[PDB]
């Protein structure tokens, strides 16, 4: 199986303006739009961009990060590898790990 892409989830103050900006930046409209969130599936560069409405803030912040893989089998291998590395993990197919500075990561399947 074995390929993957980065999930970049941004907490944004202005969702509507952000959708417009990122459509222009990556040259494609969003794949999915709902009240309070929108996501882009970008081929080049390979990226899953998630825009999360945060009307409470006044500046774009990092919401969370992720590795998006092809199937559940890849998640398992990732989950086991992270555990062997000595990283404290929580595994459901999903696995969550948090960096030293508090940035949340998730390895999940599309
Ligand atoms: Na990527």
Swiss-Prot record:
Thermal activity profile: Exhibits robust catalytic activity from 37 to 55 degrees Celsius.
* Cofactor (UniProt): Fe(2+)
Tell me the outcome of changing residue 94 to R. Nearly inactive. No change in iron affinity
Q: Which domain of life is it from?
A: Bacteria
This molecule's function is given as:
Nonheme iron-dependent dioxygenase that can break carbon-arsenic bonds, playing a role in the detoxification of environmental organoarsenical compounds. Catalyzes the oxygen-dependent demethylation of highly toxic methylarsonous acid (MAs(III)) to arsenite, which can then be exported out of the cell. Can also cleave the C-As bond in several trivalent aromatic arsenicals, including roxarsone (III), nitarsone (III) and (4-aminophenyl)arsonous acid.
What lineage does the source organism belong to? Bacteria, Bacillati, Actinomycetota, Actinomycetes, Streptosporangiales
Keywords associated with the record: Dioxygenase, Iron, Metal-binding, Oxidoreductase
Q: What else is known?
A: Organoarsenicals are used as herbicides, pesticides, antimicrobial growth promoters, and chemical warfare agents. Arsenic is the most widespread environmental toxin and is classified as a Group 1 human carcinogen.
| Entry note about domains | The thiolates of the vicinal cysteine pair (Cys95-Cys96) directly coordinate the arsenic atom of the organoarsenical substrate.
Coiled-coil regions listed in the entry: none
Domain VOC, chain residue ranges per copy:
4-110
- What are the binding positions for roxarsone (III) in this chain? 63
Which EC number(s) are documented for this chain? Answer: 1.13.11.-
Where does the chain bind Fe(2+)?
7, 64, 106
Q: What Gene Ontology molecular function terms does this protein carry?
A: dioxygenase activity; metal ion binding
- Top-level EC class as recorded in UniProt: oxidoreductase
Q: What is this protein called?
A: Trivalent organoarsenical cleaving enzyme
The subunit field of the Swiss-Prot or TrEMBL record says: Monomer.
Might you name a Gene Ontology BP term for this protein? Answer: response to cadmium ion
